[PDB]
């Protein structure tokens, strides 16, 4: 019934949408932690100090780690920022991040208050 609970329900709804089949064609690079070694990205952890991905956001939501919508939004935006920091801006994965961030920002803006 409380404001923070209602806002976190909205956040959980957004999280479910970002993980849904509707967005899977561009969301899939953000499903799991970047496996830098497996992808040959041996500079990844020198450039990205705070990795973030949607499985980590889901674990934190399930564990009641997020106390408010702003904390949730900070992790989702960190995930996008990491992609924009690491990758040249004309790379495919950046286009995919920008499309998923459009989904995120437009729905986040509909936060109940
Ligand atoms: C998240 C994330 N941020 N950067 C990457 C990434 C960077 C370089 C190479 C692969 C990469 O992720 C796998 C991938 C994505 C798109 C298309 C093909 C592979 N992934």
How far is the first residue's CA from the last residue's CA?
13 Å
The gyration radius over C-alpha positions equals 14 Å
Give helix % range.
55-70%
Largest sheet: none
Structural class: mainly alpha
Query: What hetero molecules are bound to the protein chains?
Result: 3-methyl-5-(2-phenylmethoxyphenyl)-4~{H}-1,2,4-triazole
What's the total count of β strands? 0
**CATH topology value:** Histone Acetyltransferase, Chain A
Total domain modules: 1
Strand content: under 5%
Tertiary shape = globular
Which architecture does the CATH hierarchy give at level 2?
Up-down Bundle
Q: Look at the structure and give the CATH class.
A: Mainly Alpha
Separate helix tally: 7
CATH superfamily: Bromodomain-like
Q: How do the SSEs run, as a string of H and E?
A: HHHHHHH
Organism: Homo sapiens (Human)
Domain Bromo: 2-111
Family: Belongs to the BET family.
Subcellular location: Nucleus; Chromosome
Q: How is this structure best described in words?
A:
It is found in: Nucleus; Chromosome. Homodimer. Interacts with E2F1. Interacts with (acetylated) STAT3; promoting STAT3 recruitment to chromatin. Interacts with CTCF; promoting BRD2 recruitment to chromatin. (Microbial infection) Interacts with herpes virus 8 protein LANA1. It comes from Homo sapiens. This is Bromodomain-containing protein 2. The protein has a single domain (about 1-113), classed as Up-down Bundle (Histone Acetyltransferase, Chain A). It contains 7 helices and no strands. It has helices spanning about 5-20, 25, 35-40, 45, 55-60, 70-85, 90-110. It is globular and about 45 Å long. The chain starts with a helix and ends in a 5-residue tail after the last helix. The site of 3-methyl-5-(2-phenylmethoxyphenyl)-4~{H}-1,2,4-triazole (ULB) has 10 residues, from helix 6 and helix 7.
